[PDB]
Design a protein around this nucleic acid. Structure first.
Lengths: 105, 91, 80, 97, 97, 78, 103, 95
DNA sequence: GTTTTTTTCTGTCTCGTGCCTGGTGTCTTGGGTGTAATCCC
DNA sequence: GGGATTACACCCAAGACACCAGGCACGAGACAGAAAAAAAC
DNA sequence: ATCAGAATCCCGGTGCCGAGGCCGCTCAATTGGTCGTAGACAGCTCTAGCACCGCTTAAACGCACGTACGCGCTGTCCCCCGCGTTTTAACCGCCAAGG
């Protein structure tokens, strides 16, 4: 395997990330395992949240993910919601919060 | 000025392989990815300057991912990262 | 001038309903206008300051993104 | 006719606006208010539309959060009618004075 | 004889707004912190200055959260605190989902 | 354990807060929220010391963990 | 020293050093640390000036940190600045909701 | 013996300027050192973001000015900008 | 009111290519840790 | 007794150059899709 | 109002201790000198921000009108304040018998 992405069996460009670290004014030198490690973490985070995205979009018989799906999938998670607490999505809205004092009883 | 679009397509085909996406959904996703990358990287730079270590290896990245994400996500991420380290180190 | 009074009561109603608010008092609307105004004051002050150092007489979406990240009310969607 | 002593109107429109996706404040008057605030610190500034849309997005989100905590303040007040000092207490706790 | 209630509490509020000395004394607080610290990796030593830091931050944290909770109850047309008031204040700040 | 928190301690916490009249379930609720607070704090503090490869948590790491939760405290060299 | 040559009180070159070792940029200009040092100088001047008035209030000669927290909590812009800031031996505003005062 | 840092003597002199008849506690001097640390760190982080949202890596005083009036609230900020600008003139007018 | 179930006309998206630019192979050399001795609090 | 200091080791990143197939901008035609409007509960 | 009496404030007092002066070092600021490209600047080009209007229409405004949660009041009942009484967390001074 010529490319390090094929040498990692992953989907992200590592030397991209290493140049980002170099053109970051982050450290002075950057080792060889840290960019691979961080890119793997990124790839796991993408796949993990896109799981909830896939189920949340499948909730409404629509092949395409909309932003409302993403906000729903975040707020229906616990770890991602405490992750994204200061965070707002464009075209998001919020959850159905109908209080029990409101329904006609 | 590159976005991460086909990377998202390949992750998506690896997870829900019959799923489309809108444009602005991809935009929010790349916003998300950039935010996460910046937060981790800056926290690693804090690790360096709080620890006087003139470079950063993967161990700093592991402890920073611990410092940002909570438990279950953190442990599964540490697992995935070490597995990637393993398979890249083997070849 | 007076676009602060361009805020309409039915818009405040619609925001209360998606906000989930049932019952609306009458002494609310101008208080709402004042809070919205002070919010946007701090926002556009910081965005214009970012554009002041930009040496370009036009403010971009990216500018407002960076400025609201500075406030910690950070919003995704448009890149930045 | 079918005048309907109330209850279905408000909650039904809550159901509609939470089925909803898009904005509520319409574009032009909000834009003109933005430019009036903008005409105060540096004169004569030009804008792209996506900035204004982000401003409108985050504005409505900010007010939605204010309304949510205000609503819970009212529920704790054993009332459904909101009050202004509800909003003042909410912003007191949010540290945004 | 007997004093009428509410008075001594406010008098010691005026007294306890003065000395910024630590309210929870040391040894039991230290034991509690050590016991929670036990279940991450076994038997870590501690800097006493760090213990004082934890103590300071914890006490100021709880005092401020009490202030917001107290103002919630004052808004709630009452004088006495409730646990639901703490839930309301925390729901505004956003600790719990 | 957690019951080392005395009733007049949380009362003194109300007093420096300036709170007059006290209910019942307040005490156990207080101990719970204090517990979760210290849980997150000391968790990432020991995470810092894990990266430190050393067997004592520094006061520095406590300070930086407070910064990481946006709870910046002066006074003790931070 | 450039600080004396700027007629100020904060050491320039220490700050110039710390800007280098902070990975703050790639290159560092000439007088940027002078400007930053003067900013620091006026900030601490204003803060400790109000602290001096706080000691004038209590008729104390040595500054206690309670003076510092009080002078932070009195002024508007300073308290909006240091909103997320607390200090050991801080305390709070001596403050009473008069609706809880007796009748 | 490793040599540690403080800013105590500097702000100590400044305190002696603005109040000759005034003492201070040691812990408060450490607090002020932490204060300078915190303000410096927020400024420098805004400077790095100034760099990356300007795609430049040189730092001049102009960036410091725009950083300060990004962070600090208005009236205080403009007074501080005035102090810094007059100091820039007095230094760079001479060597 | 809700919601479901037909066309329709329809906006985006995925395929499809060419241009290009960053990604890759590898030595030198150096400093940056790796580790171990030791003081030391 | 473990953290602080130092010192000898070692060892592969930085770069610097040489070789390169991918990465993205632009189109096309198709293809998931919002609504029009019956049309039940 | 109003007195008695708790509660607190506030004034010498002394003591002790750390803030501050002070003083002899040495290592980073300085001083000076030498490459170098980043950027301050000149200038080219085409986009897009702006302004304006005509047409469409759905959205706001005013009012008619009942009405029903908000609220002031009430009674009530209960359960925290507080002051008293042990009492046990804590940090000091004595019996065990084993060495």
């Amino acid at each position: 395997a010529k490319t390090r992405s094929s040498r990692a069996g992953l989907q992200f460009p590592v030397g991209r990330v290493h140049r980002l670290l170099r053109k970051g004014n982050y450290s002075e030198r950057v080792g060889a395992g840290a960019p691979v490690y961080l890119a793997a973490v990124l790839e796991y985070l993408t796949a993990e949240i896109l799981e909830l995205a896939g189920n949340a979009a499948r909730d409404n018989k629509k092949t395409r993910i909309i932003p409302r799906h993403l906000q729903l999938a975040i707020r229906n998670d616990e770890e991602l919601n405490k992750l994204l607490g200061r965070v707002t999505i464009a075209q998001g809205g919020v959850l159905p919060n109908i209080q029990a004092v409101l329904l006609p009883k | 000025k590159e976005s991460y679009s086909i990377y998202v397509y390949k992750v998506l085909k690896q997870v829900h392989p019959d799923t489309g996406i809108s444009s602005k959904a991809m935009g929010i996703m790349n916003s998300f990815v950039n935010d996460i990358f910046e937060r981790i990287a800056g926290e690693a730079s804090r690790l360096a300057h709080y620890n006087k270590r003139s470079t950063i290896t993967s161990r700093e990245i592991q402890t920073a991912v611990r410092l940002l994400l909570p438990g279950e996500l953190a442990k599964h991420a540490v697992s995935e990262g070490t597995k990637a380290v393993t398979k890249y180190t083997s070849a | 001038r007076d676009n602060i009074q361009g805020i309409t009561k039915p818009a405040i109603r619609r925001l209360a309903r998606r906000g989930g608010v049932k019952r609306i008092s009458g002494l609310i609307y101008e208080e709402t206008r004042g809070v919205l105004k002070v919010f946007l004051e701090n926002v556009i002050r910081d965005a214009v300051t970012y554009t002041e150092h930009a040496k370009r007489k036009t403010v971009t979406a990216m500018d407002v993104v960076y400025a609201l990240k500075r406030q910690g009310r950070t919003l995704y969607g448009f890149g930045g | 006719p079918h005048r309907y002593r109330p209850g279905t109107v408000a909650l039904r429109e809550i159901r509609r606006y939470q089925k909803s996706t898009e904005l509520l404040i319409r574009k032009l008057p909000f834009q003109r208010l933005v430019r009036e605030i903008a005409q105060d610190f540096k004169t004569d500034l030009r804008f792209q539309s996506a900035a204004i849309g982000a401003l409108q997005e985050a504005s409505e989100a900010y007010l939605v959060g204010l309304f949510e905590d205000t609503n819970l303040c009212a529920i704790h007040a054993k009332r459904v009618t909101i009050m202004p000092k509800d909003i003042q207490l909410a912003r007191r706790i949010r540290g945004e004075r």
